[PDB]
Design a protein around this ligand. Sequence first.
Ligand SMILES: Cc1nonc1C(=O)N[C@H](c1nc(C[C@H]2CCc3ncc(Br)n3C2)n[nH]1)C1CCCCC1
Lengths: 105, 108
Amino acid sequence: FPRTVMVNLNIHNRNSDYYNRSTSPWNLHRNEDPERYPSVIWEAKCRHLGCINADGNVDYHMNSVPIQQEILVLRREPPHSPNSFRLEKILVSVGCTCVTPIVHH
Amino acid sequence: PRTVMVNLNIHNRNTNTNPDYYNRSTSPWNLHRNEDPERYPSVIWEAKCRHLGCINADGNVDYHMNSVPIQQEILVLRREPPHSPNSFRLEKILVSVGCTCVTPIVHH
Ligand SMILES: Cc1nonc1C(=O)N[C@H](c1nc(C[C@H]2CCc3ncc(Br)n3C2)n[nH]1)C1CCCCC1
């Protein structure tokens, strides 16, 4: 396999309100880094420690937890390079789910 | 620039800062493997919700709420020209990363 490859950055496209409607709702935080491509990554932060019940109240017996995705990004290498990068692997929170807590004495 | 160089020797970045949700969730899911030799990454894991409803306190399915996949817009590299080992174009796809439980949209 090659160490260095060429990439054409002219993206071709190939084929919601859940953050508010979820029992483990979240808000998005925009993370911008001019040394990275994509420069913007949107990260989810859970709104509550617990989950929302049928009445609209917080149920503390369950937990809202972020679902993290491993993703690759391009980091400019050398720094500030307009046209050369290295792949970097990061973790990004993409939303939240409601889980039963882990309990131990 | 239209064309850039990319070094494929990945470096991890903070993968050990805040490092079974798919099973513990009220909207559980399983991951399915999707392989495409013309794409980089060649393997993508896609979540599929286990149920239409969500799991309640009693351990039963609550049909009044819906499990939905959280889809994320992701970029991939597609070999260009086809079968090229070292040249690609970016393409945008949607990947289901996990599931959450939502109230349904209702028309009254
Ligand atoms: C997983 C997965 N399975 O297949 N490919 C990947 C994957 O990591 N692809 C990468 C990727 N795509 C994005 C779009 C971001 C849009 C904004 C955003 N906010 C939260 C997130 Br998560 N994102 C995602 N970033 N990095 C690209 C691979 C090749 C070089 C370019 C990057």
